[PDB]
Amino acid sequence: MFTGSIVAIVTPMDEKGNVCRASLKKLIDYHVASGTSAIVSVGTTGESATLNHDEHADVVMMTLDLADGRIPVIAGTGANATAEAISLTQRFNDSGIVGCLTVTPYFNRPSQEGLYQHFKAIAEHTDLPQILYNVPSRTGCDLLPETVGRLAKVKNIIGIKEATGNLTRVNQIKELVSDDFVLLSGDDASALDFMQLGGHGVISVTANVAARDMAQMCKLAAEGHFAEARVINQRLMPLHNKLFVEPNPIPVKWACKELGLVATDTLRLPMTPITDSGRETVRAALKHAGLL
Amino acid sequence: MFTGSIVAIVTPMDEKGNVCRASLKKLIDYHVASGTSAIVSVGTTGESATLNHDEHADVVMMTLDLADGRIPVIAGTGANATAEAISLTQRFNDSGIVGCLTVTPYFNRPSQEGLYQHFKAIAEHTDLPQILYNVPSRTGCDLLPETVGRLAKVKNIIGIKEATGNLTRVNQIKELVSDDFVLLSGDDASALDFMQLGGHGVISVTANVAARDMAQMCKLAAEGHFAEARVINQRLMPLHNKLFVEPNPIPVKWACKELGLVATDTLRLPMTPITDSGRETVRAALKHAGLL
Amino acid sequence: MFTGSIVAIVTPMDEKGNVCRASLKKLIDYHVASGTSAIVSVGTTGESATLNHDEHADVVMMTLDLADGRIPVIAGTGANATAEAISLTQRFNDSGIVGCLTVTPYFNRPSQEGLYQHFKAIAEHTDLPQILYNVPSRTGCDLLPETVGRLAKVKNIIGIKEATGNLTRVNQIKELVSDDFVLLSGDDASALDFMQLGGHGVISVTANVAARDMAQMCKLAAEGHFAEARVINQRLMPLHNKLFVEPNPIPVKWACKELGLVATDTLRLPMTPITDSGRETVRAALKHAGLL
Amino acid sequence: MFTGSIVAIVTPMDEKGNVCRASLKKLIDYHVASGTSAIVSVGTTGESATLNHDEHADVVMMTLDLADGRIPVIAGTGANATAEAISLTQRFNDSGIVGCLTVTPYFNRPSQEGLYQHFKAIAEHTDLPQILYNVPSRTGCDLLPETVGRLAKVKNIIGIKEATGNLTRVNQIKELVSDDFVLLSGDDASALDFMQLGGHGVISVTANVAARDMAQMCKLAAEGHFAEARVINQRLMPLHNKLFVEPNPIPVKWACKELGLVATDTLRLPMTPITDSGRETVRAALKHAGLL
Question: Site described as Part of a proton relay during catalysis, positions (chains A, B, C, D)?
Answer without folding.
Answer: 44, 107
